[PDB]
Design a protein around this nucleic acid. Structure first.
Ligand SMILES: NC[C@@H]1O[C@H](O[C@H]2[C@@H](O)[C@H](O[C@@H]3[C@@H](O)[C@H](N)C[C@H](N)[C@H]3O[C@H]3O[C@H](CO)[C@@H](O)[C@H](O)[C@H]3N)O[C@@H]2CO)[C@H](N)[C@@H](O)[C@@H]1O
Ligand SMILES: [Mg+2]
Ligand SMILES: [Mg+2]
Ligand SMILES: [Mg+2]
Ligand SMILES: [Mg+2]
Ligand SMILES: [Mg+2]
Ligand SMILES: [Mg+2]
Ligand SMILES: [Mg+2]
Ligand SMILES: [Mg+2]
Ligand SMILES: [Mg+2]
Ligand SMILES: [Mg+2]
Ligand SMILES: [Mg+2]
Ligand SMILES: [Mg+2]
Ligand SMILES: [Mg+2]
Ligand SMILES: [Mg+2]
Ligand SMILES: [Mg+2]
Ligand SMILES: [Mg+2]
Ligand SMILES: [Mg+2]
Ligand SMILES: [Mg+2]
Ligand SMILES: [Mg+2]
Ligand SMILES: [Mg+2]
Ligand SMILES: [Mg+2]
Ligand SMILES: [Mg+2]
Ligand SMILES: [Mg+2]
Ligand SMILES: [Mg+2]
Ligand SMILES: [Mg+2]
Ligand SMILES: [Mg+2]
Ligand SMILES: [Mg+2]
Ligand SMILES: [Mg+2]
Ligand SMILES: [Mg+2]
Ligand SMILES: [Mg+2]
Ligand SMILES: [Mg+2]
Ligand SMILES: [Mg+2]
Ligand SMILES: [Mg+2]
Ligand SMILES: [Mg+2]
Ligand SMILES: [Mg+2]
Ligand SMILES: [Mg+2]
Ligand SMILES: [Mg+2]
Ligand SMILES: [Mg+2]
Ligand SMILES: [Mg+2]
Ligand SMILES: [Mg+2]
Ligand SMILES: [Mg+2]
Ligand SMILES: [Mg+2]
Ligand SMILES: [Mg+2]
Ligand SMILES: [Mg+2]
Ligand SMILES: [Mg+2]
Ligand SMILES: [Mg+2]
Ligand SMILES: [Mg+2]
Ligand SMILES: [Mg+2]
Ligand SMILES: [Mg+2]
Ligand SMILES: [Mg+2]
Ligand SMILES: [Mg+2]
Ligand SMILES: [Mg+2]
Ligand SMILES: [Mg+2]
Ligand SMILES: [Mg+2]
Ligand SMILES: [Mg+2]
Ligand SMILES: [Mg+2]
Ligand SMILES: [Mg+2]
Ligand SMILES: [Mg+2]
Ligand SMILES: [Mg+2]
Ligand SMILES: [Mg+2]
Ligand SMILES: [Mg+2]
Ligand SMILES: [Mg+2]
Ligand SMILES: [Mg+2]
Ligand SMILES: [Mg+2]
Ligand SMILES: [Mg+2]
Ligand SMILES: [Mg+2]
Ligand SMILES: [Mg+2]
Ligand SMILES: [Mg+2]
Ligand SMILES: [Mg+2]
Ligand SMILES: [Mg+2]
Ligand SMILES: [Mg+2]
Ligand SMILES: [Mg+2]
Ligand SMILES: [Mg+2]
Ligand SMILES: [Mg+2]
Ligand SMILES: [Mg+2]
Ligand SMILES: [Mg+2]
Ligand SMILES: [Mg+2]
Ligand SMILES: [Mg+2]
Ligand SMILES: [Mg+2]
Ligand SMILES: [Mg+2]
Ligand SMILES: [Mg+2]
Ligand SMILES: [Mg+2]
Ligand SMILES: [Mg+2]
Ligand SMILES: [Mg+2]
Ligand SMILES: [Mg+2]
Ligand SMILES: [Mg+2]
Ligand SMILES: [Mg+2]
Ligand SMILES: [Mg+2]
Ligand SMILES: [Mg+2]
Ligand SMILES: [Mg+2]
Ligand SMILES: [Mg+2]
Ligand SMILES: [Mg+2]
Ligand SMILES: [Mg+2]
Ligand SMILES: [Mg+2]
Ligand SMILES: [Mg+2]
Ligand SMILES: [Mg+2]
Ligand SMILES: [Mg+2]
Ligand SMILES: [Mg+2]
Ligand SMILES: [Mg+2]
Ligand SMILES: [Mg+2]
Ligand SMILES: [Mg+2]
Ligand SMILES: [Mg+2]
Ligand SMILES: [Mg+2]
Ligand SMILES: [Mg+2]
Ligand SMILES: [Mg+2]
Ligand SMILES: [Mg+2]
Ligand SMILES: [Mg+2]
Ligand SMILES: [Mg+2]
Ligand SMILES: [Mg+2]
Ligand SMILES: [Mg+2]
Ligand SMILES: [Mg+2]
Ligand SMILES: [Mg+2]
Ligand SMILES: [Mg+2]
Ligand SMILES: [Mg+2]
Ligand SMILES: [Mg+2]
Ligand SMILES: [Mg+2]
Ligand SMILES: [Mg+2]
Ligand SMILES: [Mg+2]
Ligand SMILES: [Mg+2]
Ligand SMILES: [Mg+2]
Ligand SMILES: [Mg+2]
Ligand SMILES: [Mg+2]
Ligand SMILES: [Mg+2]
Ligand SMILES: [Mg+2]
Ligand SMILES: [Mg+2]
Ligand SMILES: [Mg+2]
Ligand SMILES: [Mg+2]
Ligand SMILES: [Mg+2]
Ligand SMILES: [Mg+2]
Ligand SMILES: [Mg+2]
Ligand SMILES: [Mg+2]
Ligand SMILES: [Mg+2]
Ligand SMILES: [Mg+2]
Ligand SMILES: [Mg+2]
Ligand SMILES: [Mg+2]
Ligand SMILES: [Mg+2]
Ligand SMILES: [Mg+2]
Ligand SMILES: [Mg+2]
Ligand SMILES: [Mg+2]
Ligand SMILES: [Mg+2]
Ligand SMILES: [Mg+2]
Ligand SMILES: [Mg+2]
Ligand SMILES: [Mg+2]
Ligand SMILES: [Mg+2]
Ligand SMILES: [Mg+2]
Ligand SMILES: [Mg+2]
Ligand SMILES: [Mg+2]
Ligand SMILES: [Mg+2]
Ligand SMILES: [Mg+2]
Ligand SMILES: [Mg+2]
Ligand SMILES: [Mg+2]
Ligand SMILES: [Mg+2]
Ligand SMILES: [Mg+2]
Ligand SMILES: [Mg+2]
Ligand SMILES: [Mg+2]
Ligand SMILES: [Mg+2]
Ligand SMILES: [Mg+2]
Ligand SMILES: [Mg+2]
Ligand SMILES: [Mg+2]
Ligand SMILES: [Mg+2]
Ligand SMILES: [Mg+2]
Ligand SMILES: [Mg+2]
Ligand SMILES: [Mg+2]
Ligand SMILES: [Mg+2]
Ligand SMILES: [Mg+2]
Ligand SMILES: [Mg+2]
Ligand SMILES: [Mg+2]
Ligand SMILES: [Mg+2]
Ligand SMILES: [Mg+2]
Ligand SMILES: [Mg+2]
Ligand SMILES: [Mg+2]
Ligand SMILES: [Mg+2]
Ligand SMILES: [Mg+2]
Ligand SMILES: [Mg+2]
Ligand SMILES: [Mg+2]
Ligand SMILES: [Mg+2]
Ligand SMILES: [Mg+2]
Ligand SMILES: [Mg+2]
Ligand SMILES: [Mg+2]
Ligand SMILES: [Mg+2]
Ligand SMILES: [Mg+2]
Ligand SMILES: [Mg+2]
Ligand SMILES: [Mg+2]
Ligand SMILES: [Mg+2]
Ligand SMILES: [Mg+2]
Ligand SMILES: [Mg+2]
Ligand SMILES: [Mg+2]
Ligand SMILES: [Mg+2]
Ligand SMILES: [Mg+2]
Ligand SMILES: [Mg+2]
Ligand SMILES: [Mg+2]
Ligand SMILES: [Mg+2]
Ligand SMILES: [Mg+2]
Ligand SMILES: [Mg+2]
Ligand SMILES: [Mg+2]
Ligand SMILES: [Mg+2]
Ligand SMILES: [Mg+2]
Ligand SMILES: [Mg+2]
Ligand SMILES: [Mg+2]
Ligand SMILES: [Mg+2]
Ligand SMILES: [Mg+2]
Ligand SMILES: [Mg+2]
Ligand SMILES: [Mg+2]
Ligand SMILES: [Mg+2]
Ligand SMILES: [Mg+2]
Lengths: 49, 272
RNA sequence: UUUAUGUUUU
RNA sequence: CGCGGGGUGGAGCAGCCCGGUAGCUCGUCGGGCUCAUAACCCGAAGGUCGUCGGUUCAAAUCCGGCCCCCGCAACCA
RNA sequence: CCUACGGGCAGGCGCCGAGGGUAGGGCCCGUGACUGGGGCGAAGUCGUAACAAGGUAGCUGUACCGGAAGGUGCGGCUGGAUC
RNA sequence: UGAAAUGCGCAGAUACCGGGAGGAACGCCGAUGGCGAAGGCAGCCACCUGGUCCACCCGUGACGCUGAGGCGCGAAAGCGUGG
RNA sequence: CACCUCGAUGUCGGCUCGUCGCAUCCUGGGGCUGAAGAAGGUCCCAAGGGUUGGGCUGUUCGCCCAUUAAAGCGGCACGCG
RNA sequence: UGCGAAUGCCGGCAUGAGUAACGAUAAAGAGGGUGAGAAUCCCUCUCGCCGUAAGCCCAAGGGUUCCUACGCAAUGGUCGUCAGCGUAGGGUUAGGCGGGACCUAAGGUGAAGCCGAAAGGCGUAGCCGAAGGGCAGCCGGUUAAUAUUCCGGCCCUUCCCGCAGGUGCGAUGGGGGGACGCUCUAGGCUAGGGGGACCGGAGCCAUGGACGAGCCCGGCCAGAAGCGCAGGGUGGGAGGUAGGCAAAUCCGCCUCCCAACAAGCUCUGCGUGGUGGGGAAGCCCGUACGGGUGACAACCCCCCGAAGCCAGGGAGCCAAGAAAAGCCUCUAAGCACAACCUGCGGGAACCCGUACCGCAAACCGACACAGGUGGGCGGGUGCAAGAGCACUCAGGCGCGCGGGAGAACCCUCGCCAAGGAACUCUGCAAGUUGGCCCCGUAACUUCGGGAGAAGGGGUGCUCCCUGGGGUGAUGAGCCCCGGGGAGCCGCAGUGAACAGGCUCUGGCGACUGUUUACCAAAAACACAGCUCUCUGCGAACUCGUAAGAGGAGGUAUAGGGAGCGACGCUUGCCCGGUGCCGGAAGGUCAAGGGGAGGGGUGCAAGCCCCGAACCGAAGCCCCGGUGAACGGCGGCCGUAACUAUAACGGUCCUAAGGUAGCGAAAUUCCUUGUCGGGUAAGUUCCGACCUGCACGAAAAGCGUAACGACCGGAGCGCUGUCUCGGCGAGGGACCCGGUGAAAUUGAACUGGCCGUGAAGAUGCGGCCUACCCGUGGCAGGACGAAAAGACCCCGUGGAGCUUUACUGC
RNA sequence: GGCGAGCUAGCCCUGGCCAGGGUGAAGCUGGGGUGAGACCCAGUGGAGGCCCGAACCGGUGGGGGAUGCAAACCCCUCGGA
RNA sequence: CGUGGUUCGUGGAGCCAUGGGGGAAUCUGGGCGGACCACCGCCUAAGGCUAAGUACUCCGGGUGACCGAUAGCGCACCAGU
């Protein structure tokens, strides 16, 4: 039956993407937090083109 | 008149529809003057500020002329009478001799191919607009300006109207469709006649769906809710109200007056 | 401007 | 037997708190008006206050028991 | 089978057919817990509507109301007494 | 009103004057009168329109009377929708 | 009453499957009778076996229909999820 | 700083156990091959399964899974030589397909501007934003693997430059246009399909017959200009002009004059078209596939025929159906040895995607998971139609453990003597019915319905006669609708598959619809419709501190709130209390005004404090109104010439004492009320009565046709529900081979009875019984497992909710 | 103080989808009817939160599954269409 | 007048700050010494800057009656994997 994950690449960037993080100060802080922990990825990896 | 239907389904049985014979050729409306696009949203920014709305037929906006003084002395011929989905009234398309085109909310009796005009000049026959000061006491008139130059506001609804009761100073006294007696500035335009298509009040939606078409989504009673949702929520086994009948937000909905007490407006009124 | 009523049969 | 109210001329109600005398409408009896009855008018009679005990100087009245009456309660199980 | 055999008969099949069965209707009669009013039956109860102007003139179609008669509104008739 | 009481009124009533709003009905004329098939119809004006009478003796030539059904009208109350 | 059980002893009725007690419903044996016979009443012995099918209600139970030799009462965590 | 317990924490290893399982009951068998090893890999043949798919093509999402070589430790539920797995190498080619150097939608963002303690929130233009608009590629061939991408053929787009011809050229600005709904549709076509006695073709004559107008296979695809058949779109002049925020010669409006017709001018679709290209069966090869030939293949007639195209076609309807650019036109600056337009020619054309999976072993579900996932194609025959159903093409599959056995038991199926609901809470379940044609059809009704009512008959095949319709001709064929007659066969003709059981009678809800994703689909919500109430427009109301926004680009026939809930007939009395509404008085009432009068301190001028009259809002008090506002709508006693009963009366209270209509009811406690009906028998059901514990009128009262997977009662039909079981089938269970879990588990050498014990003992006492160990089975016990009882209490634990609790905002 | 509407609810913009049967409203045309009408009858027409029924959307009853194929599935049946 | 700050929770409540209202003076001016008054004293508001002593440890170094791979940072090992 239809589950929770229904991946759509456009959603993912537009929602959790790098640029979307930088508008909201809440988001700029996530980046800050993630960067300070030294996460290898500050933002969900997405793809194609 | 009105359209009835043989009961060939339930609800086709009670259904009543508008009599469209009044409508001069129509089917497509008139671009140029109107339509614009209608942004069809049910909420303010983000959020629902009026309940039970949405859905219902896509609708083009005919942009209508509420300041007639715009062209004084220029006459115009009534080209058509059309169906406008955005109001109870019907709109008249009128061709000015300028070759300018405007829609007017169509008064009762105004018929295609008759000359119409606006100004202090202004014959007092139907479909014509004048400042109130020059309309003769006792004449029934529609599409009034509430303040001069601000545009028609009062009696625009299907088959509505206002009577001119008297005159005081630069103000004249109208009895509005509500029955309120109000002073309105003399310089305010208005247009002789009543609004027309007054049979409007007698159509019968007939069924759940017809109410949907009009963009009207089901309305649910507090009584049917839980107490989290409403003063009337809870208990069940149904219940009387158990308090003065209230709105979702808690104010009394039977009798409680609303109009702001101290209002500059307050000084120009006089009735119910 | 205070009244209602009169047992059955000859 | 849980909680509350009650028992007063023939009927229906007061009077009980706070003590001391029992009052109202109807009904009853006697007399009037009427040809007569009722209405109407003038007079009169009639209650130990459910009951036993207690309290007091005195108990319908304050107190306790028993007998009846009305109302409410009997939920989670 | 009989022949007087291009036949008749027995026999076979078929139509229709009394009726029987199944199904659904229409009319009439009887009957039924209960219920409605009606007629009739010397001396039971409540009132007094009508007959005299009936003590609110009566009656009337309708509507509403009321233990009951009745009452009241609207209009109508005189089959209403009274100067 | 029989007499009263309810009601209303010192929060300024009733009585009086001026202004406005709204609905209904049309005093005198008006008659014991007129019109209408009936129910019914009454301020004034205009439009549309029915019946009816009189004068003339001109035209049709019995084309008439009534009238089961049918159809239409039909006071008051009453009902539906809007006012 | 509040003793084991609230870090769980699933709770009515039915169904299936029984098993046991006897204070016996039937059948077997008896005494007494207000036991003529037949048929009962009443007590004693006796638990081997037997102890019906329906209508009503979730019902147990009752009531009712039709039968029967009889349509027994109980216990078994109101036996048995 | 010493561990045995904390359902402790981390780890390791046990127990159950060689136990359950190995993931759809579509299904397999054999021969050959490879190899150390083969049920499992390859190949052949036979068998079975999908086929509106389980085939094919898109889009998502995935991201090497693609092709090949070499591999088998692990992954694969077994095996593996195989693989979507390991290693390695290769593989994705575009001016025309998609997307971007185009447009705009919601929304987003946001010069101006507005607002906000900061962060930030708004917001006209503009900008971003697409599966919408716009825009030029068709057929075939090639690779192990890409192809509208390479190739071949045929065909087009834009940009730059240049010639020639033409024209007032010129835009982000004006105007046109783009440009739009739903249902139903016409004519002509195309895709697609069927038939052919015609054309082409390897071959074939068995097994009794057939050398035949036999069987079998195939009889196309694309294509500029021109042409033809369809169809779309469009009037042409002139004059006036004050409108289209400048200007227009354009558009608009007014008046004349021509056409009125597609005539014309166009633009599409289809046909034809130079030419190019394809091209079966079968047989021969080799697979791991593809290749030779069949061929110089043929390449045509007829029919059926779209939901597709002509497309902006038409008709009807109401709920009244995007934008912007491209495009055309108009003019403005400007510029007019510019420019733009048309034709020809040359040159110039960039970035990204392109493998493979894609109803699934490659996506979402921890899995090679019986689930989920949008668009297109989806052949043939028959059955009324159809995408339904059965079989079947193409194509794809037999689902990654097997072999046996033939027990109980389970699951899923088939049949059943007599009976036929006796089963049970209940006909739950399963039976019955079942498609089409015709006959036929009641109460009631809102006249539509109720209706598929009910209940019947027909249904195949054969020969003969025969009526219409479509194409063709006014004809033959071929399609399509039928009609009549005479026969044939079986148990049976919608011969298999798909395909209502029906009636009567209550309750609730009018109806279609909505809901507790994952125990409730309902009598609950919603619903048209009725009432009340608010709201004069910068409306009320809602969201927001605000700006702002919704309401609404609406205006009282509108909008918010509330109840009620189609419709029918109705909806009574009480305004004392509460709420709301009205009330220019009066009472109270805060700050403030006001200061009679008092106090501190100074020698004093003073400074500084209290502070009575009095004047001061709303609110409350107070007076009124209000019920489709919250709400409420009595008690005792008596009375009739039989008795009963009480139309009648008395009295007490109230704001008023429940009207109509209903009533043992979705309400009735007593209760299985009483009576009637149904039944052999009826705690339910139906009709009555009324003694209504404790109906009653918009938290509506009482009815109502129709409707209902709602809930109740009854009958017919028919049944394995049952008396009451039986047999049978298949998937399991069982035995063998392969792989191999789980909760649970103080340790165990773990019996019955009568006792005892913390009151229910394998574990204590007495006695009884009992050789050791298993396997298939049933569930009485281990107060069996699971979940630190949801009930209950307790905690001065918590949370949601209410209000005339307190206190605040 | 942040993160979430890739599930789910509502709404907004933009596209798409609904085999095939059945019933046969209005309106039209004609006929009758009338003073004129209402109206009646035919034929045509093709309306509907109309009917049957696939796709599609559901989730009614039952059976199965319950360390499942599945942390909601499967079969039969059933509602809309 | 309304609040904050101080130990000061309205308290006899000054001091410093200030949202609102009113609203001066320039040495004989002004604030303060805890309501107010007198006296006696202190200090000069409504402009600004100012090292050092102080805080911290991403970083380097030295020490340890600090751990020694279930310890010690989450990470001694290609771990914010
Ligand atoms: N026929 C009488 C009809 O009914 C009613 O009449 C009935 C009653 O009203 C009437 O009852 C009357 C009563 O009015 C009057 N006030 C008292 C009287 N005793 C009664 O009389 C009745 O009762 C007694 C029994 O005791 C009988 O014997 C007697 O025959 C009978 N009429 O008796 C009548 C029955 O016959 C109407 N009055 C009358 O208009 C109507 O027509
Ligand atoms: Mg779905
Ligand atoms: Mg997940
Ligand atoms: Mg996307
Ligand atoms: Mg999205
Ligand atoms: Mg890195
Ligand atoms: Mg916005
Ligand atoms: Mg936002
Ligand atoms: Mg309306
Ligand atoms: Mg509602
Ligand atoms: Mg609720
Ligand atoms: Mg909430
Ligand atoms: Mg609330
Ligand atoms: Mg409530
Ligand atoms: Mg209730
Ligand atoms: Mg009397
Ligand atoms: Mg007498
Ligand atoms: Mg008393
Ligand atoms: Mg007293
Ligand atoms: Mg005493
Ligand atoms: Mg409780
Ligand atoms: Mg016969
Ligand atoms: Mg009298
Ligand atoms: Mg009278
Ligand atoms: Mg009198
Ligand atoms: Mg009288
Ligand atoms: Mg009289
Ligand atoms: Mg009455
Ligand atoms: Mg009475
Ligand atoms: Mg008369
Ligand atoms: Mg007074
Ligand atoms: Mg006359
Ligand atoms: Mg008269
Ligand atoms: Mg006249
Ligand atoms: Mg003559
Ligand atoms: Mg003559
Ligand atoms: Mg006759
Ligand atoms: Mg009348
Ligand atoms: Mg009238
Ligand atoms: Mg205990
Ligand atoms: Mg335990
Ligand atoms: Mg014995
Ligand atoms: Mg005994
Ligand atoms: Mg015996
Ligand atoms: Mg004997
Ligand atoms: Mg039963
Ligand atoms: Mg019982
Ligand atoms: Mg017990
Ligand atoms: Mg038990
Ligand atoms: Mg049980
Ligand atoms: Mg240890
Ligand atoms: Mg220990
Ligand atoms: Mg441990
Ligand atoms: Mg085992
Ligand atoms: Mg086993
Ligand atoms: Mg096994
Ligand atoms: Mg071999
Ligand atoms: Mg070998
Ligand atoms: Mg094999
Ligand atoms: Mg992809
Ligand atoms: Mg890989
Ligand atoms: Mg591969
Ligand atoms: Mg391996
Ligand atoms: Mg291996
Ligand atoms: Mg393996
Ligand atoms: Mg596996
Ligand atoms: Mg090998
Ligand atoms: Mg590989
Ligand atoms: Mg190319
Ligand atoms: Mg492509
Ligand atoms: Mg492109
Ligand atoms: Mg470029
Ligand atoms: Mg753009
Ligand atoms: Mg913004
Ligand atoms: Mg900003
Ligand atoms: Mg696009
Ligand atoms: Mg596109
Ligand atoms: Mg393109
Ligand atoms: Mg092409
Ligand atoms: Mg190709
Ligand atoms: Mg279009
Ligand atoms: Mg067509
Ligand atoms: Mg062919
Ligand atoms: Mg042969
Ligand atoms: Mg031959
Ligand atoms: Mg072809
Ligand atoms: Mg000109
Ligand atoms: Mg201009
Ligand atoms: Mg279609
Ligand atoms: Mg089209
Ligand atoms: Mg069109
Ligand atoms: Mg643009
Ligand atoms: Mg130009
Ligand atoms: Mg110039
Ligand atoms: Mg490719
Ligand atoms: Mg593919
Ligand atoms: Mg699938
Ligand atoms: Mg698909
Ligand atoms: Mg799968
Ligand atoms: Mg695959
Ligand atoms: Mg698998
Ligand atoms: Mg998967
Ligand atoms: Mg799907
Ligand atoms: Mg069929
Ligand atoms: Mg198709
Ligand atoms: Mg199929
Ligand atoms: Mg095949
Ligand atoms: Mg398998
Ligand atoms: Mg058989
Ligand atoms: Mg049988
Ligand atoms: Mg039978
Ligand atoms: Mg039943
Ligand atoms: Mg049930
Ligand atoms: Mg069933
Ligand atoms: Mg018929
Ligand atoms: Mg019918
Ligand atoms: Mg039938
Ligand atoms: Mg048959
Ligand atoms: Mg046959
Ligand atoms: Mg023909
Ligand atoms: Mg035939
Ligand atoms: Mg069949
Ligand atoms: Mg069938
Ligand atoms: Mg059917
Ligand atoms: Mg419903
Ligand atoms: Mg429904
Ligand atoms: Mg649920
Ligand atoms: Mg839930
Ligand atoms: Mg369920
Ligand atoms: Mg349902
Ligand atoms: Mg359910
Ligand atoms: Mg907001
Ligand atoms: Mg606010
Ligand atoms: Mg605002
Ligand atoms: Mg706004
Ligand atoms: Mg707006
Ligand atoms: Mg309701
Ligand atoms: Mg009421
Ligand atoms: Mg009453
Ligand atoms: Mg009263
Ligand atoms: Mg009241
Ligand atoms: Mg009051
Ligand atoms: Mg009140
Ligand atoms: Mg005064
Ligand atoms: Mg006052
Ligand atoms: Mg003061
Ligand atoms: Mg002061
Ligand atoms: Mg006040
Ligand atoms: Mg007053
Ligand atoms: Mg009350
Ligand atoms: Mg008596
Ligand atoms: Mg008597
Ligand atoms: Mg009485
Ligand atoms: Mg009963
Ligand atoms: Mg009740
Ligand atoms: Mg029941
Ligand atoms: Mg009943
Ligand atoms: Mg009551
Ligand atoms: Mg009720
Ligand atoms: Mg009510
Ligand atoms: Mg209701
Ligand atoms: Mg009812
Ligand atoms: Mg239902
Ligand atoms: Mg069976
Ligand atoms: Mg078997
Ligand atoms: Mg003991
Ligand atoms: Mg024991
Ligand atoms: Mg011992
Ligand atoms: Mg053993
Ligand atoms: Mg065993
Ligand atoms: Mg056991
Ligand atoms: Mg346990
Ligand atoms: Mg516990
Ligand atoms: Mg507690
Ligand atoms: Mg607490
Ligand atoms: Mg927050
Ligand atoms: Mg969503
Ligand atoms: Mg929903
Ligand atoms: Mg489809
Ligand atoms: Mg005609
Ligand atoms: Mg439908
Ligand atoms: Mg259906
Ligand atoms: Mg189900
Ligand atoms: Mg179910
Ligand atoms: Mg189950
Ligand atoms: Mg089970
Ligand atoms: Mg403080
Ligand atoms: Mg304090
Ligand atoms: Mg202190
Ligand atoms: Mg202080
Ligand atoms: Mg000081
Ligand atoms: Mg200060
Ligand atoms: Mg200040
Ligand atoms: Mg100084
Ligand atoms: Mg100091
Ligand atoms: Mg001091
Ligand atoms: Mg002070
Ligand atoms: Mg100092
Ligand atoms: Mg360091
Ligand atoms: Mg060491
Ligand atoms: Mg380690
Ligand atoms: Mg470590
Ligand atoms: Mg170590
Ligand atoms: Mg560190
Ligand atoms: Mg660690
Ligand atoms: Mg590392």
């Amino acid at each position: 039956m239809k589950r929770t994950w229904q991946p759509n690449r456009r959603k993912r960037a537009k929602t959790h993407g790098f640029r979307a993080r930088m508008r909201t100060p809440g988001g700029r802080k996530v980046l800050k937090r993630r960067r300070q922990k030294g996460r290898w990825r500050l933002t969900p990896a997405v793809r194609k083109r | 008149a009105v359209k009835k239907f043989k009961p060939y389904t339930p609800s086709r049985r009670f259904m009543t529809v508008a009599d469209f014979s009044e409508i001069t050729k129509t089917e497509p409306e008139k671009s140029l003057v109107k339509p614009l696009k209608k942004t069809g949203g049910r909420n303010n920014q983000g959020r629902i500020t009026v309940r039970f709305r949405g859905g219902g037929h896509k609708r083009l906006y005919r942009i209508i002329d509420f300041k007639r003084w715009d062209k004084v002395g220029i006459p115009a011929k009534v080209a058509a009478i059309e169906y406008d989905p955005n109001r109870s009234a019907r709109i008249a398309l009128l061709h000015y001799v300028d070759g300018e085109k405007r829609y007017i909310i169509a008064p009762d009796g105004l018929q295609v191919g008759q000359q119409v005009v606006a100004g202090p000049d202004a014959p007092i026959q139907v479909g014509n607009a004048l400042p109130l000061r020059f309309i003769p006491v006792g004449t029934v008139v529609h599409a009034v300006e509430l303040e001069p130059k601000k545009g028609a506001k009062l009696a625009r609804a299907a088959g509505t109207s206002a009577q001119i009761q008297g005159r005081e100073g630069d103000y004249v006294i109208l009895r509005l469709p509500s029955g309120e007696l109000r002073k309105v500035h003399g310089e305010c335009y208005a247009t002789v006649g009543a609004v027309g298509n007054a049979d409007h009040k007698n159509i019968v939606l007939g069924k759940a769906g017809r109410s949907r078409w009009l963009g009207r989504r089901p309305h649910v009673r507090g009584a049917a809710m839980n107490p989290v949702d409403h003063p009337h929520g809870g208990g069940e086994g149904r219940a009387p109200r158990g308090r003065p009948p209230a709105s979702p937000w808690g104010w009394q909905t039977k009798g409680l007056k609303t109009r702001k007490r101290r209002k500059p407006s307050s000084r120009f009124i006089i009735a119910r």
